[PDB]
From Swiss-Prot:
Disruption phenotype: Impairs the production of norsolorinic acid, as well as of the four major forms of aflatoxin: AFB1, AFB2, AFG1 and AFG2. The modification O-(pantetheine 4'-phosphoryl)serine is found at residue 44. This is Norsolorinic acid synthase. Residues 7-86 form the Carrier domain. The gene is aflC. Induction: Actively expressed at 27 degrees Celsius but not at all at a temperature higher than 35 degrees Celsius. Expression is repressed by curcumin. Norsolorinic acid synthase; part of the gene cluster that mediates the biosynthesis of aflatoxins, a group of polyketide-derived furanocoumarins, and part of the most toxic and carcinogenic compounds among the known mycotoxins. The four major aflatoxins produced by A.parasiticus are aflatoxin B1 (AFB1), aflatoxin B2 (AFB2), aflatoxin G1 (AFG1) and aflatoxin G2 (AFG2).
Length: 89
């Protein structure tokens, strides 16, 4: 975070989508990069719960208050974020 990201495998990339599916309400089979967390109405509650599960269920050292409502936008945004291959920050 703030120069250098983390880096997850496609296995962790698979595990995230199901946590997202649950808390977003979008079926895994419909989860495409066209989906937009803000467009779907992902509130503060859900967006916090998702990144929280990342830490507890998956064991991701993402961050303490990582919210998909502000720090992420689309689905791919979360995907790339895991690796940090955008080097946006």
């Amino acid at each position: 975070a703030m120069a250098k990201g983390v880096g997850v495998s496609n296995e962790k990339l698979d595990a995230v989508m199901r946590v997202v599916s649950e808390e977003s309400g979008i079926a895994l089979e419909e989860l495409t990069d066209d989906s937009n967390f803000a467009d779907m109405g992902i509130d503060s509650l859900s967006s916090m719960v998702i990144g929280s599960r990342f830490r507890e269920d998956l064991g991701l050292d993402l961050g303490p208050e990582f919210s998909l409502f502000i720090d992420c936008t689309t689905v791919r945004a979360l995907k790339d974020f895991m690796l940090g291959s955008g080097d946006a920050g």
